Amino acid sequence: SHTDIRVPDFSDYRRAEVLDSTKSSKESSDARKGFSYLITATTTVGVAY
C-alpha cells in the first residue's frame, strides 16, 4: 500500500538548528537561511577584479 511509504531519516545532514522535530521552526528559518548566502554575495564583490 501507499501508506507503507515514509521518508527515511535525514538527521546526519540537517543544519544544527532544525534537528529538533518538535519546535515549529518559526524564527530558526530566517536566521538559518544565511549560511552560504553572503558566500554568494561577497563572491560578487570579488568579481570586481
Binding site: I5, F10, F35, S36
Partner: protein, 79 residues
C-alpha cells in the same frame, strides 16, 4: 528530439530529496573524506604507478651512461 519528457521508460522507482537551505553544505569532511580518498588510492595504485617507475630507471641509466661515454676517462686513456 532529446528533451526531458521523451528519454526512456521507467517504473516503480521512488526518490527523496531535501532542500539546500535545510541542510549543511559541509557534512562529514575529514571523518568520511580521508578514509574514502585512501581506499581510492589503494584501488588504483597497482595499475598507474609501475609504468612510471620504469621511466625513472631508464632515465637514470640514460644520463649516467651519457657522462662516462664522454669526458670521464680514468683508465682507458693510455698509449
Amino acid at each position: 528530439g532529446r528533451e526531458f519528457g521523451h528519454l526512456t521508460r521507467m517504473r516503480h522507482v521512488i526518490t527523496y530529496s531535501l532542500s539546500p537551505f535545510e541542510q549543511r553544505a559541509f557534512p562529514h569532511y575529514f571523518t568520511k573524506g580521508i578514509p574514502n580518498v585512501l581506499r581510492r588510492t589503494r584501488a588504483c595504485i597497482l595499475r598507474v604507478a609501475p609504468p612510471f617507475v620504469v621511466f625513472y630507471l631508464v632515465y637514470t641509466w640514460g644520463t649516467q651512461e651519457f657522462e662516462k661515454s664522454k669526458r670521464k676517462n680514468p683508465a682507458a686513456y693510455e698509449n
